[model samples]
Target: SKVVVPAQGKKITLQNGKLNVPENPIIPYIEGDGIGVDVTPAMLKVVDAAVEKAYKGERKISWMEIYTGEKSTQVYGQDVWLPAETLDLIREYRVAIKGPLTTPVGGGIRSLNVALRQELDLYICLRPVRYYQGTPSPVKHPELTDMVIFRENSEDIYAGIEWKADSADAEKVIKFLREEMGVKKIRFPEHCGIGIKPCSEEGTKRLVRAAIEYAIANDRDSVTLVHKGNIMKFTEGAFKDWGYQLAREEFGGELIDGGPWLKVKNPNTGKEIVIKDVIADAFLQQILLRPAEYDVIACMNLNGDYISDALAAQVGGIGIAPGANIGDECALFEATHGTAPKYAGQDKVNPGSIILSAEMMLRHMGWTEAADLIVKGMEGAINAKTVTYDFERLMDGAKLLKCSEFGDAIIENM
Candidate 1:
């Protein structure tokens, strides 16, 4: 066996789909590729500081380094980007956090990130995009853009079910569509690529349920189902319908104003939570125009991918955005940004993304005090105007710090 467990720490287990976290849980971490070298260490330091500050000597995390991306190839031999042992250990442990991995060139694996999500059946791509006070933003009121995205992580276009153009498989699919199905929608049927979008009731309901559950638990005002139902019809359209159905059936949501929008009373807070739908295009525009109107968002894979990045840009760029891919039994939190290969080992980039991702992981483990401290620390750090180059360059009176320095600032604040 290539994996080694920490002697002092216990493995985190899933007892009936709920995490049973230990005081010192052995959490596996992928160091990622490129700038992952810079950011991962910063994240580890900041997380350790927060846990230590919050619980004193009562709780800690035993971080087990797991290899993936470029590092994995070096460790496991050539072309082995993702090792079997890495996946096995993550599954056995049930919760893991990773920095951004390099998407290999010349296309053996489409995306190492997507492969991990699919491999582990991590179906909820949770992204909470909220602006930090004093962080430079393109939007006039970035504070209004507080929303949690529940992206359908398993199916739709992200499933990578496509035939390349001019290939035999593409030709076969095109011919079958035109002849067998009498489909005339293909504009360029000769050299056209064919991709199958699979959206199931099970997938749709589960994602929507997660979004609604989050809204209820967090005492949010609304859970909006954003979809391109006007065009995609069966797939995207059905997502909206199924979301509403789940709200009505599972959450006791009643239709409001004689129509589609439903309202349910929060069991915890006794506040009315609205269940609503918006066409993806209109929703995108409205997020810019009136961001405060949206609270919790649920959408299919492709739309979620676009919306999350767009929302990130409004507050700050993807440099500080945090993401988590979750399933019923396991979760993998990650930085929402890509590896900046040119800036690798230079200690220049922001570690906020992975640091906040660790904050999310702590909350997932029921260590809310540690998670809250991370948020408080980040808020204090940003408000103090001591940030990395990304935010420093944008803001007027900000002091620029290195990647590691920013992590230290967070700890100092905590």
Candidate 2:
């Protein structure tokens, strides 16, 4: 296995002639903690099967494994939870994928996952929440589970902002609010915790742009900006306002001076583009109240985390949820859930998240035929009532499939 791969390397250039890939498009990869042990192999197996089935040896994926976590710490050093080399690898690759990582309780690091997303300017986090046929569910209608959640990855509360309750900076903010603003009833604890959430216009627009782009590319119905700016006026409020602003500025023609507009580049564009807005908290109610109405959601970090996870729980749980981080020229898909440490070495854990993430990877790489095969296979298997414990446990009389069996079934269907 070649460890070092560029976005456009010599071999690719030689085989295809003169840098088919403009730069080295090396993609970083990590097998996250816990069930990542089982999921990584499961992800790879499903992808390979899909490629072979769809392309019939005509196309393939070039994947590289990079390291992070307990494994990384041991290999690199005790202090090296996230090594500089690991980051360098992602930069070299321009894209990457991973299973969930463990936070290593107490004091390991802020969050390797969060850290990398920020460092790389992976501004868009896309969580596709569609229902598989045999998926676990909670709502009256699991049939209406097909929506994508686009969370702003770089800004909002996800931006690390903390001050010791007793620190000088903390005092300054408290004092400013008390004296300058003349708020007499400001609570003062001996130890105060402070966090600042700042969302810039640049950050807001870029995320919305990605959501609109996804809808445009996929021929979706509409892009809904879910926000709760009513409570927190400046930040979250501005998010909702900025979203509509994007529709007007860029997607205006499609949105009309009035309603949604279809994409028009040359003549005969297939689908139209539509944009709308919803309050964040109300949006949650809306998802439950009307799942079909919500298509692609553009939101902030905290809201993204909350809504996506909630939606995952609604569909089944994070176990079946897949996520992706996409920027201008880079992408990294991931399992939206976490490392199930108890099932680390045991193959009993389901690997749907990573496998489906691989499906997203295939689509992003312009291998839609292969991606479609994987998706169709999963859907077919689900419809057939062959599913892993996640779904089987949730539904009555459902076929109880093992973790590996479910993966095998997807490939077999393909």
Candidate 3:
């Protein structure tokens, strides 16, 4: 058996609203951990079905599954939390998708998710939420909502900047906080930890630029910069500033800016720019209160975690939230949530997240008809009310369906 990715998949791109992607795209590595075992194959099956039914085998997905999780550790050794070559595969292929990998509270040796992103510089975490019909929902009109969130993937507290309270690094950073920055109210009891929040203008600008481009490309109405600069002025504050600056710089007439970006102009002449912001916390309320009023959102890491989850709660669960981590040159599709190890191998979990993520990837591949069919089939199954326990137990009069059964249901509907 090959331990490394020995092949590369073909690729394609868009030109004049038609699919121009490679005939077969490569997937270097895929981690099937916990629900991954259930969801990963289910998503692949769904994607294959969508591609076949839509293209009649004229288009294909050439997938290469390399391991990470219980399977890989068993083969490689205990220290194989995340292998170096797996990271390399992601960098080489430029795009990939995976199910979840289990990570406890600081238990897993290394985060496969964080490693892939940090290593590849995949900085934009994009999630699109839309309620699938017939799925039991907590809201009156969950089907009436759809929103896309562009999260800054590489920075903020997710940066893993930390100092153990008793450690030397902690002492040094604490001393700097107290003596240099005048941070007074500091408290750390035992293993104090510090996570760096590096929200650079470069990072922030790239994320917002993509959000605006998505708006323009997809014909979205507006893009909102979600931040909490109302309190944490520097980190999140700068995120908001950079977001508007990017919009103004790249998508001048497309933004609704009312800030320093106004000073932006062509090199030949001076002019104004457009873009704006909303406090992160308040933005959360806006997602639920008036989701239709917004189309795209750009925010920092923590805010994205909250926004994506909150909106997922509104539309469906995280299981149905489709996510992508993208850069200018590379993109990856993955589960928005982490691996739920407790539910691993049960074949009783929802495969919706990975399935929908594949749909997003397929759409990017210009398989719009295939993507639409999967979505339509999902909605058809949802409306059929034959879903798994997640939706069954969601509300009264709901019927729970098994995971594989739902997969078959989606395929049949297609």
Candidate 4:
């Protein structure tokens, strides 16, 4: 696997599924589409400042720039949305960070983000949503909405199996379903497009195992498996059954009296972690009405997708939401927002998401001091009311800061 390496630094490697970062570890990063121009550099500047401040030249991140999205197209060829060598570099480094990517409006590539996850087999989409102090929220007690979400990656309907309506492939699939498979539930077959929703026991159990393991390790009070079992029975419904079965079989959980939910003890903390299930609709309302009841959530791919953004809104906008894609040994931290093309190069969109994502990356690398510095930097900036457009508009008397200035503010605070 040939890759274009940065001349300055050596590639970071993982030892025993953990980042064995040197004093100066070369971290790969993708300067994504649109506003990546602003946030990506901002994130780098802030992170470098944090590391330098935290360790005073003792530790640092040697950023290795890898082209992707529009930048990749320009660097490689016209249509090279995701080059094979870029992924090779990520695999070699074992940990990388990226900013927001431009999703196609009609159709080009479906999504480079999706391609990266599938290419790396990053099976767990980890989103930790917690409220920051002085953040505006729609909920009464936004502070209570602290929860980490484990979204199943690589499967469910997001596998991109849908056929265009009235097309030859759609007709063939509908004909085959009606003739051989006998799936007559697709009403208006003449105008229908179909997608295959694959939810296997293997997929469900692995995702649930990761979520439960995280709960135990973090001393979380509970792990709630949210699913729409009643309607999408085989796919979303069986997810619940497989999750509970895995909890009981592997984690030594037992049904609390008769059926459904189970209770297990954390091996690390010796505290009880209740395993429970929730319908997707009810869970949505409960997150607002009784968010304190839930701690960690394991959800199907689609349900998790919706829940992550919705929950982000409960505390603040997605502008501050940080996210990561994790597999057995590799992880890529990223901002959970889109490329606001209009805001490209404006230096106005919030840099909090990407910066916080870098904080997660640092924590993942066992660089807790640097990571805590980032959090403190963010808290200090927000508390000073020196923020970008996204937060400024919502926060009264907030001092409006450009994207670049906000990064400087974070650094100054740190």
lDDT of 2 by residue, 1-414 (tens): 224454543222222312233222344679888888788888778887887888787665666677788777766776767777777666555567898787777783688789878877788888988877666677778778688988999988778877778999888887887778887765764577778899889999988877887777777787887778778889988987787777667764354565533332212355665577778878888888898887888899999999998888887756878888876646778987778777677786778888888888766665678899988878887777787766777777767776777888888788
Cα-based TM-score, every candidate = 0.98, 0.88, 0.88, 0.96
In model 3, where is the ten-residue run with the lowest total lDDT?
Answer: 261-270
lDDT rank order: 1, 4, 2, 3
Estimate, for each residue in 1-414, the C-alpha lDDT of model 4 and write its tens digit: 224565666656766755677887788899889899999999999999988888889887788888788888788877777888878878888889998877555554687898999899899999999988887776779998899999999899998879988999999989998999998688799887788899999998989999998998889999999999999999999999999999989999988888688999898889999999999999999998899999999998899999999999998857999999998767899988988999899889999899999999999888899899999989899889998888888889999999999999999888
TM-score, prediction 2: 0.88
Q: Can you give the lDDT of residue 356 in candidate 4?
A: 92
The lDDT values for all models are 0.91, 0.75, 0.74, 0.88
Query: Largest TM-score belongs to which candidate?
Result: 1
How much lDDT does candidate 1 score? 0.91
State in Å the error of residue 345, model 4. 0.7
Model 3 per-residue lDDT tens digits across residues 18-54 = 4456767765547567778778878888888998999
Range of the 10 consecutive residues with the lowest summed lDDT in candidate 2: 10-19
lDDT of 1 by residue, 224-336 (tens): 99999999899999999999999999999998989799998999999999999999999889999999999999999999999999999999856889899998778999988
